[PDB]
Amino acid sequence: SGLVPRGSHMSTTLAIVRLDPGLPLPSRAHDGDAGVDLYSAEDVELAPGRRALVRTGVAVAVPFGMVGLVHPRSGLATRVGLSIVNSPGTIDAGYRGEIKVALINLDPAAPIVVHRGDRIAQLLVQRVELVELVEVSSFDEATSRG
Amino acid sequence: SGLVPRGSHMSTTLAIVRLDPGLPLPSRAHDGDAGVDLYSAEDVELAPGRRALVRTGVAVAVPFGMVGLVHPRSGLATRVGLSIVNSPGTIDAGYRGEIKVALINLDPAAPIVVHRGDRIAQLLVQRVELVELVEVSSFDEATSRG
Amino acid sequence: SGLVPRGSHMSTTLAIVRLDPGLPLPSRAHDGDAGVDLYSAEDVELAPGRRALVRTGVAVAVPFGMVGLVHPRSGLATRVGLSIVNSPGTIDAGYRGEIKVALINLDPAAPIVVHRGDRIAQLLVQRVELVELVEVSSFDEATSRG
Ligand SMILES: O=c1ccn([C@H]2C[C@H](O)[C@@H](COP(=O)(O)NP(=O)(O)OP(=O)(O)O)O2)c(=O)[nH]1
Numbered sequence: 001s002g003l004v005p006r007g008s009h010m011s012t013t014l015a016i017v018r019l020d021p022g023l024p025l026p027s028r029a030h031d032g033d034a035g036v037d038l039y040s041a042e043d044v045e046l047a048p049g050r051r052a053l054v055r056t057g058v059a060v061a062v063p064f065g066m067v068g069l070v071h072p073r074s075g076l077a078t079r080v081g082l083s084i085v086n087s088p089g090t091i092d093a094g095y096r097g098e099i100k101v102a103l104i105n106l107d108p109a110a111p112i113v114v115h116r117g118d119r120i121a122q123l124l125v126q127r128v129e130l131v132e133l134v135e136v137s138s139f140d141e142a143t144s145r146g
Numbered sequence: 147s148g149l150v151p152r153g154s155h156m157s158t159t160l161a162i163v164r165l166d167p168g169l170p171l172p173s174r175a176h177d178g179d180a181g182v183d184l185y186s187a188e189d190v191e192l193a194p195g196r197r198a199l200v201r202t203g204v205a206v207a208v209p210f211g212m213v214g215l216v217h218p219r220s221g222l223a224t225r226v227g228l229s230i231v232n233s234p235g236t237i238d239a240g241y242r243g244e245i246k247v248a249l250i251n252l253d254p255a256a257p258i259v260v261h262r263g264d265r266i267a268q269l270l271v272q273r274v275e276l277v278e279l280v281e282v283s284s285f286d287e288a289t290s291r292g
Numbered sequence: 293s294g295l296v297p298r299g300s301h302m303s304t305t306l307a308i309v310r311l312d313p314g315l316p317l318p319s320r321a322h323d324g325d326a327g328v329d330l331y332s333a334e335d336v337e338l339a340p341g342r343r344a345l346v347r348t349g350v351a352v353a354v355p356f357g358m359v360g361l362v363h364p365r366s367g368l369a370t371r372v373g374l375s376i377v378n379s380p381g382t383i384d385a386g387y388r389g390e391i392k393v394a395l396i397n398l399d400p401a402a403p404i405v406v407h408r409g410d411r412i413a414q415l416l417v418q419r420v421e422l423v424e425l426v427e428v429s430s431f432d433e434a435t436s437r438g
């Protein structure tokens with residue numbers, strides 16, 4: 001597998017520092033999966049309605065022209081009401097700090113216990129358009145929907 | 147319209163199975179819209195704060211190198227506080243099951259009634275970078291923000 | 293800076309109307325940032341659990357083949373529990389109205405005060421696949437995960 005297949009020639013490298021090397025490197029659960037799963041570095045208990053800012057133990061260098069996106073996992077979302085307050089979290093190209101996940105318990109009654117080493121979110125990487133705004137007085141000067 | 151116009155030459159086909167053929171195929175509400183609207187196959191009532199995992203009656207084959215993304219509709223979000231616990235839901239290229247939507251009622255007091263055949267979310271399809279992680283000891287070895 | 297550098301040759305213009313010209317044009321907080329920050333045109337107070345549909349004072353013309361995406365800011369999300377009900381908000385290419393943000397207070401006890409001129413969300417622009425659905429009876433006729 002050190003040979004990059006023709007179909008993966010243009011695939012993107014993401015530099016990562018394991019700030020907590022006791023956690024595995026994030027990985028795709030299955031071939032073709034959009035995201036790599038991020039771990040919790042911490043034990044945390046969330047009562048109903050409470051949030052926390054949870055360390056993942058990693059820092060990344062998203063390439064210029066791209067964005068990292070932190071999305072909730074669907075299983076925990078349905079089973080226990082686990083969500084992310086700022087979802088999708090937006091990780092900028094220039095960020096060199098630790099990725100942190102703003103977990104929240106949206107269940108009305110049952111606490112959520114997160115253990116160190118649990119997979120608590122997924123990180124996608126996508127291209128983004130670094131847009132140049134052009135201010136106009138009206139869209140004329142410059143649709144079905146309107 | 148069987149002729150693919152020059153400007154749509156590179157547009158992507160998405161194979162879909164209507165597991166519930168009583169529902170219309172998902173469609174864009176207007177030309178240029180980012181997403182196709184997903185239907186509920188089910189009647190569901192959500193008391194304030196409650197969630198459900200709602201069947202959409204479809205399965206798709208997102209192409210390798212892409213991702214499907216399940217987003218809430220803005221009208222229901224404002225009018226009645228309808229949201230999605232794991233938003234944006236992440237549909238992987240390898241998934242061949244039914245798309246399910248984790249609806250939640252974020253209103254404090256009024257129940258939300260969803261009927262079979264209502265449009266309850268929107269599905270976008272985007273390219274994703276299937277990233278190769280490169281572990282480094284520091285970003286040096288390998289920004290304004292820092 | 294009127295010269296487009298070789299590396300920004302293909303970067304995208306976004307036409308914008310300041311419907312409220314008392315607010316600054318949205319901008320990236322730092323070079324390489326994925327999104328430009330949207331302002332509130334309004335003063336709004338959100339009690340715990342309450343939502344509002346907040347005017348941003350801008351209208352944009354997202355290019356055909358692209359999507360605008362309204363994401364929460366991470367600082368307010370952690371500090372005070374500020375979220376967006378329909379996050380990520382989906383701004384279609386054909387939309388020429390004012391961008392509105394569906395803010396919600398997910399804190400259990402403390403109200404959130406938003407002032408006119410505060411930065412309350414971020415707007416990304418990305419390509420989207422305008423998909424052509426092909427209905428199949430089974431995926432055969434037309435994976436690790438299954
Ligand atoms: O909104 C969604 C999100 C996911 N899904 C399906 C498709 C996706 O490929 C699959 C797995 O999604 P997640 O990775 O978000 N869930 P989780 O990590 O809990 O499960 P898995 O171990 O299967 O990855 O669940 C939906 O039907 N609706």
Ligand SMILES: O=c1ccn([C@H]2C[C@H](O)[C@@H](COP(=O)(O)NP(=O)(O)OP(=O)(O)O)O2)c(=O)[nH]1
Pocket residue numbers: 175218219220221222362378380381382383384385387390391392393394
């Ligand atoms: O956060 C948002 C999301 C949408 N919008 C606008 C732009 C978008 O093109 C339009 C429709 O968004 P949705 O498709 O999410 N809403 P809905 O499906 O309820 O209405 P429609 O019938 O108009 O599609 O609403 C915002 O101003 N802010």
Ligand SMILES: O=c1ccn([C@H]2C[C@H](O)[C@@H](COP(=O)(O)NP(=O)(O)OP(=O)(O)O)O2)c(=O)[nH]1
Pocket residue numbers: 070086088089090091092093095098099100101102321364365366367368
């Ligand atoms: O889920 C997240 C989101 C952001 N972040 C980090 C990386 C990102 O580049 C940085 C800033 O994100 P936001 O722009 O969403 N936050 P805010 O606008 O409050 O702060 P800033 O002034 O730094 O942009 O915070 C995370 O660690 N986790």
Ligand SMILES: [Mg+2]
Pocket residue numbers: 029073122
């Ligand atoms: Mg998963």
Ligand SMILES: [Mg+2]
Pocket residue numbers: 175219268
């Ligand atoms: Mg719509």
Ligand SMILES: [Mg+2]
Pocket residue numbers: 321365414
């Ligand atoms: Mg910011």
